[PDB]
Copies of this chain bind each other. A is one copy, B any other.
Amino acid sequence: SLDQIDLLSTKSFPPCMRQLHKALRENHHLRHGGRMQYGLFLKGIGLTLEQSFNIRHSYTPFSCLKIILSNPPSQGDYHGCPFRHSDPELLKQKLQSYKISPGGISQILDLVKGTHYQVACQKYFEMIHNVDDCGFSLNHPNQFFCESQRILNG
């Protein structure tokens, strides 16, 4: 059942995925663009997404620069990266729904405006995971996943 990963997406998914997850639950559907981003991200974590959707243990996953550059999202479309594609004022609100302190939120917000999205994600990661220095140069959402899974089951 798709819902089995609610908490997993909260805790360890990137913003770009966690949104697609939230979306899928709430609209019981996804357009093309967002089926491939979240579907192949799931693949990347050893899990399959199939249609009334379900997940089961088991095609190149999407990179933060494939997401950031190609195919920006129309309305209805819930795919793309929120550091880049989200409008800032709403971005502050999403960061706010995630219980991220204003300090971080500010810092991040500076990075977005610097067009430093991946470093912003990086900052975020530090914040949800409570680490001062994350330790890895981020370029792929599957890397966000395992770099998170490490801290959690650590």
Contact = CB atoms under 8 A, between A and B. Distances in A.
Q: How many A residues touch the partner, as a band?
A: 20 to 34
Interface stretch (A25-33, A44-52, A72-80, A121-129): A44-52
Interface string A129-153: 0000001110110110111011011
Contact of A147 (B47, B56, B57, B146): B146
A150 B146 contact: yes
Contacts of A66: 154
A153 B60 contact: yes
A22 interface: no
Contacts of A104: none
Interface in A1-21: 4
B57 A153 contact: no
Contact of A44 (B4, B57, B153): B153
A71 interface: no
Contact of A136 (B4, B44, B61, B136): B136
A63 B153 contact: yes
A58 B47 CA distance: 12
A86 B10 CA distance: 39
A92 interface: no
